[PDB]
Design a protein around this nucleic acid. Structure first.
Lengths: 31, 122, 131, 200, 170
RNA sequence: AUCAGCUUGUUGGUGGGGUGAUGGCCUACCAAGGCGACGACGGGUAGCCGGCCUGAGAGGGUGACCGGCCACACUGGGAC
RNA sequence: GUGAGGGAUGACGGCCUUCGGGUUGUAAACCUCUUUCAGCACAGACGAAGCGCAAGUGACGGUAUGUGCAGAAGAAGGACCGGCCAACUACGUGCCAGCAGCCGCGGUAAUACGUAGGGUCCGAGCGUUGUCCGGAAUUACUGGGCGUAAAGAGCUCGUAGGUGGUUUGUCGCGUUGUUCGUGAAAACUCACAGCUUAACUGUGGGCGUGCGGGCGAUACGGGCAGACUAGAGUACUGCAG
RNA sequence: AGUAACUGACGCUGAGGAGCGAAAGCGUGGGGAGCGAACAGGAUUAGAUACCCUGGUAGUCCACGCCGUAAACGGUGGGUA
RNA sequence: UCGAAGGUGGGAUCGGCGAUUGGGACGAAGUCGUAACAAGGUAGCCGUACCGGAAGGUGCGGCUGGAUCACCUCC
């Protein structure tokens, strides 16, 4: 299989992890 | 799968996507023209498509396409809307019926008149 | 483990047939001997016999090939299997190859073919198809 | 309704003559219109549709009635082709025309519709009337001396009467022995194409 | 008299430094309508030439279909590449019921009444190959009786024997 | 199951009561059961069927007319 | 039902043109014929072996129908024509106006837009929208798959469940045969009959794929009571890591 | 593996469930030579939050526990003929 | 006694709005960079951790779904 699919999945995962890191304290305080 | 797997879980059919959810099970709906304007199609084509914003009786705000050459629609105009997709416009799934309620049949049409609400010449 | 001896017998027959073997040996049981009898009487195999093995008895089956080395069996399928078993009434007996094949049916009168069962008006379990 | 427009149009389009003695079709055997000479593309659907149009324009039967006939013929325990052909041939107007009492099928239909005939002793004016075994079709006495029947009864030298019918009286009685079989029908075209078309 | 069926014409191309070089491939069926059919696949720079090569190749490879009167002997299922075509005999007067490629092959082979369905790989070449593979799986009842060394009545149903009698009478 | 626990006249017995009739149907006392992943308890939706439409068939959708049963009669209780 | 037969080096007009001519087109005009259904006049029901011991009694209805009269006389539209998918040209416009179910067509020479000729399909209908099934084997019981296309849990142990070697006897649960009861009528299907035909209506079979009771069989599955050692495990003797 | 002495179908799979499960990471307490995220300079570059160089903290190691993921791949579930 | 409706109370559950705020999809031509595909010019990817305007960089373990290995003298 082409690595293009892995690249799309990894970019989605990386962006989501960045978003989670950017709002850790906000999530902790709202939950 | 195994027959036992089938008798344990069975087969679940694919779900059906509801089309033209604003009509609510009716062939047509009556609406009022929220705003009447023009807009441009997708990139491969180019024109000034005539599109109206209609508030239906199902309390759904819907954008509808006006077929034919010329139209006389303005604000607060009662129109009768039907289902139909326009490939160029991204999210337009409805068309205004010509010759019904306020919207008028087009002028000087002699072929496919019934599709544009033009009466036969006397 | 071994679940279907009948299916194993049918697959031994099929594998030997595809490889043009003239002989196939398998452990013996009454059911296997009876379907072997039906196969021989219907002309699908040459002949069969039972020797004695180290523990029990064996089944020896001779495969029939034509003069030009063409197989006398075109297919062997197991219909009723452990798990999903198949029973047919005397009126809805299956047809194999539009009647050109033979369907073995286990009735209370013994092992019969589809035509024999239809003539005698009995039903049972559809063991296999031969064509 | 009925088809009323020109007749040779259909014959020219379908490539065969349906009336039988039409000189215009012989003069120009090609489709009508400006582009009647343009070469056509070959397609099985086109041939099947043309066969069906041939059948339903020879007998003057509209599409819905023809589909009803096809369903009836398929339902019957014969075979579809000759069953459909025999259902078509049993219509009263076709019987009248095939008995030599009408030069063309159109005038046979016109005569039947005007109540000039009388089947089994009861007046019948329905061209789609189907005719069974041992039916006696008579002309009512009032119309015996009319011009059409006069010229029909003194030119009995045209197309031969098929076996399954028999004009028996000097008053031109019609007796039906049995419904025709495929051998005696003597019709153009091919029924198998119609069966293929309606199975699509 | 030989009937022919050009079932598909495709414009293929190979790339070169200058550009694209287009040729034509035609799949042609040749038969006599009496029980023999042939399949040809010719390629040339021009459509009529490719059709000619397909016709000659189809004529070279001939194969006899075991018809019984007007239909095939028994139901069969043939698979070639990813194409699956099932065949089923039908009572007289039913007509040919098949898709375009299968219909062409069967009409060329002389089959009049048959139920045929395509069950995969809509590609015309592979559908034709699968139809031919199915037709090659048919067995004449006499050969079946010969294989099992039995009289023709003990092997075939009486309906087939009656059908053969009527066909040979006609 | 992105609804896992539910039930205290609730599960059973005895004596009474009640009813056209059997029966926690009601009652006093006694015992602690009963149901549930073979999905109880919740949430959503729905009158059910002969049939009807589609399909090669299996199956899918549906319950208009006609015919059977059910439920209701402004909303909620109640008896005569 | 809106007509039928005959009717030409094939009228006019329209349209195209290679300017020759071709198509509308046997179509029309004209000459005969018939009048269905409409229109007018006359007669006029069955439904009622009914109801009533009164003399009469039909809402539909003076309807259906029948017979006369006159005259082709009063009676055709809709969609589509790039491919799927029957059916092509001209003019106008030019990335506009627009079309479109998909592919996609509009860039002054568009068979895809608009209009006219021509054509095709249907026809008192013809198209559009909405909803369901089919095509879709695209939830695959019939009838699909999982190395790389979506799809083998990271790997084991094990609970409920599913499934199970050879053989003897027995049961008759499943399975199978037959019989009885039931499966309303209607519907569906076959045949026949009545409406002038058909739709429709009636009659007689089948169907009602099922369930319940009796009787028969025991090959297979299962239960019960045994037996065997080829699976599985233990014992003993060695062995490699 | 061999002998086959023993039992006599005691087998297979297994929803859920339980256990084990690289590295990184987390907690408590030790240890810390080398390597080395982060971090510092140097260089290259138009710019270098990099590649290269010099340093270098967590970590890597041990004890006891968490975590429960991987290209945990033969991208190939288990049993049998 | 039971008992509809009504009243009081504390919770369940389903939705709408919400100042502000997060990401997603699409958009010929805007700005910043070159990350991947040819060894893509530091092989790529997987889990994890840290860091950075951004693609991304680096450590640890793993995978090949990674390219090239000329000449190579004795026989």
């Amino acid at each position: 299989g082409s690595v293009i699919k892995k690249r799309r999945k990894r970019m989605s995962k990386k962006k989501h992890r960045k978003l989670l890191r950017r709002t850790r304290v906000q999530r902790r305080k709202l939950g | 799968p195994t027959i036992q797997q089938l008798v344990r879980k069975g087969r679940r059919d694919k779900i059906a996507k509801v089309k033209t959810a604003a009509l609510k099970g009716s062939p047509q709906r009556r609406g009022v023209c929220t705003r009447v304007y023009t807009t441009t199609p997708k990139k491969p084509n180019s024109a000034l498509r005539k599109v109206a914003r209609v508030k239906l009786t199902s309390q759904v705000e819907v954008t509808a396409y006006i077929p034919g050459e010329g139209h006389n629609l303005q604000e607060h105009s009662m129109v009768l809307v039907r289902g139909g997709r326009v490939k160029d416009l991204p999210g337009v799934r409805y068309k205004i019926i010509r010759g019904s309620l306020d919207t008028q049949g087009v002028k000087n049409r002699k072929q496919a008149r019934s599709r544009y609400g033009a009466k036969k010449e006397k | 483990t071994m679940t279907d001896p009948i299916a194993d017998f049918l697959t031994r027959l099929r594998n030997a047939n595809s490889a043009y073997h003239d002989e196939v040996t398998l452990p013996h049981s009454k059911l296997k001997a009876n379907i072997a009898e039906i196969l021989k009487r219907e002309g699908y195999i040459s002949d069969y016999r039972t020797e004695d093995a180290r523990v029990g008895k064996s089944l020896v089956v001779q495969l029939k090939y034509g003069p030009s080395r063409e197989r006398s069996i075109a297919g062997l399928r197991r219909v009723s299997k452990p798990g999903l078993r198949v029973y047919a009434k005397s009126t809805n007996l299956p047809r194999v190859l539009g009647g050109l094949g033979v369907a073995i049916i286990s009735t209370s009168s013994g092992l019969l073919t589809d035509r024999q069962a239809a003539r005698q008006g009995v039903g049972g379990e559809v063991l296999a198809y031969v064509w | 309704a009925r088809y009323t427009g020109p007749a040779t149009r259909k014959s020219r389009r379908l490539g065969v003559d349906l009336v039988g003695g039409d000189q215009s079709f012989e003069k120009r055997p090609y489709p009508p219109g400006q582009h009647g000479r343009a070469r056509i593309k070959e397609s099985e659907y086109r041939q099947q549709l043309q066969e069906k149009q041939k059948a339903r324009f020879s007998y003057g039967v509209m599409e819905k009635q023809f589909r009803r006939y096809y369903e009836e013929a398929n339902r019957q325990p014969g075979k579809t082709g000759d069953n459909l052909l025999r259902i078509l041939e049993s219509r009263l107007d076709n019987v009248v025309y095939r008995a030599g009492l009408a030069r063309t099928r159109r005038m046979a239909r016109q005569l039947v519709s005007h109540g000039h005939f009388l089947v089994n002793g009861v007046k019948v004016d329905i061209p789609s009337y189907r005719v069974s075994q041992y039916d006696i079709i008579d002309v009512k006495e009032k119309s015996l001396n009319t011009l059409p029947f006069q010229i029909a009864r003194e030119t009995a030298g045209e197309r031969p009467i098929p076996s399954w019918l028999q004009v028996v009286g000097e008053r031109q009685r019609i007796l039906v022995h049995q419904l025709p079989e495929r051998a005696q029908i003597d019709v153009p075209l091919t029924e198998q194409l119609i069966v293929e078309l309606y199975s699509k | 008299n030989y009937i022919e069926r050009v079932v598909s014409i495709n414009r293929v191309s190979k790339v070169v430094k200058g550009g694209r070089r287009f040729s034509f491939t035609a799949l042609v069926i040749v038969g006599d309508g009496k029980g023999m059919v042939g399949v040809g696949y010719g390629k040339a720079k021009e459509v009529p030439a490719a059709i000619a090569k397909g016709v000659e190749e189809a004529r070279k490879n001939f194969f006899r279909v075991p018809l019984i009167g007007s239909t095939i002997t028994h139901p069969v299922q043939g698979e070639a590449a990813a194409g699956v075509v099932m065949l089923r005999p039908a009572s007289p007067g039913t007509g040919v019921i098949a898709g375009g490629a299968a219909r062409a092959v069967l009409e060329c082979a002389g089959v009049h009444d048959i139920l045929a369905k395509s069950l995969g790989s809509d590609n015309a070449i592979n559908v034709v190959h699968a139809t031919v593979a199915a037709l090659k799986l048919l067995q004449r009842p006499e050969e079946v009786a010969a294989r099992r060394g039995l009289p023709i009545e003990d092997v075939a149903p009486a309906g087939m024997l009656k059908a053969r009698r009527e066909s040979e009478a006609l």
